[PDB]
């Protein structure tokens, strides 16, 4: 629920063992590298790189899973999009975005590794799908890996989460005949010194301080 409401801060606060992260099981590539990226983010702009309404006219948005349920209703990530075929087709898509925001743009996406071939055939109507993501440097191709797996969050499939920092002027292209969890929103990053990520569970008041530490703030003249 931070999405609509927060875009700036002084630092980020995370709890030691947060449970509400990746709702649909899978590997978040370079998760720690992303953390280190975001440590230096003082703020950003969460914009709808690929509008749900007009970017995917002929693909069934509104793919939803129980593993990401909200208020009891099955739902899905908000900054991502679970494309699925429509009217029996999953026509090849070739959507593109050109970073003209003059700030490096954090793009997210995902690849669905379904638990079985019938599930993939249902969602995407192809057995041998692929996902190609390209930029001026970044080039990559993902093939879905189909396999039964341990039933994490009551889900037997996976989603591999991927990201990249599309630099200004660079153009990112997504191609796919299936298995894409496309982005709905991305982030334009504003770097900032002094900011950072603090892991802790301490409470907050509307106290103000000069220094901060995970156990508590410091308001004192001493050097050490």
């Amino acid at each position, epitope marked *: 629920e931070l999405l609509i409401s927060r875009e700036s801060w002084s630092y980020i606060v995370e709890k030691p063992n947060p449970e509400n992260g990746t709702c649909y099981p899978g590997h978040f590539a370079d998760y720690e590298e992303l953390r280190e990226q975001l440590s230096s983010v003082s703020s950003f702009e969460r914009f709808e790189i690929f509008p749900k309404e007009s970017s995917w006219p002929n693909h069934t948005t509104t793919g939803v899973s129980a593993s990401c349920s909200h208020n009891g209703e099955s739902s899905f990530y908000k900054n991502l999009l679970w494309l*699925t*075929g429509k009217n*029996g*087709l999953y026509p090849n898509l070739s959507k593109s975005y050109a970073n003209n925001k003059e700030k490096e743009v954090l793009v997210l996406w995902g690849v669905h590794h379904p638990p079985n071939i019938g*599930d993939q*055939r*249902a*969602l995407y109507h192809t*057995e041998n799908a692929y996902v190609s993501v390209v930029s001026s440097h970044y080039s990559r191709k993902f093939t879905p890996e189909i396999a039964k797996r341990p039933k994490v969050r009551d889900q037997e499939g996976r989603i591999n989460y991927y990201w990249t920092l599309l630099e200004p002027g660079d153009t990112i292209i997504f191609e796919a005949n299936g298995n894409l969890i496309a982005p709905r929103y991305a982030f334009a990053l504003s770097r900032g010194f002094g900011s950072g990520i603090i892991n802790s569970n301490a409470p907050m008041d509307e106290c103000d301080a000069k220094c901060q530490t995970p156990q508590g703030a410091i308001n004192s003249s001493l050097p050490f």
Partner: antibody
Amino acid sequence: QVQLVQSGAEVKKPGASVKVSCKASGYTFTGYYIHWVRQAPGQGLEWMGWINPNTGGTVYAQTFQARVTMTRDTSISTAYMELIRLRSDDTAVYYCARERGTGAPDAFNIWGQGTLVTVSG
Amino acid sequence: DIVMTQSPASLAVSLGQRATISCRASKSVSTSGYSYIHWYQQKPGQPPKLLIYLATNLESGVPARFSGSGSGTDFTLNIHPVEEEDAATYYCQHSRDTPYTFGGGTKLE
């Protein structure tokens, strides 16, 4: 006319093997998957697997993974199910079904006459 | 593995009335803008024949007495008006994922 026609009924000894045939007609055999289904006498249906006659690729159900072998001769647009190490409880009507459409997991609309495979000593 | 429970196991309906066979899944069969249920009719000694696919779409050549309804996990086959020709066994089936599992059957009297 579109249709599938299957090899006639037959018996087999327990421990033996059976080959059922499904010859297609009236449509491009390679474009539509083909599933094999079975129905024990007076019982309900249960699904064996499918073969993609274009590629010859196959999927089978777990309770049939070890013993079923689907194939196809595309020259004569024909599919085969081979069931080995027959047990008595495998006596049933075996049908070949074709999907109503390509690509999407649509339903089975073309069926075979059904081949009655009886297994006993 | 998605299990299609089906009920009631038998119906006793009279000509001209409405017959409602209720199928349920252990999990949603709906996605891709489709609900992957299919309802088949099998008369004795015959193969099945498809009545409706994707839980709502009547197949060509089928009478309009048959109608499909429902979504997600709960689906229904409604016959009206029942007729002598509808005395048969009516099966649910899902194409959502493997294994494609039927429903067990519903005799109609």
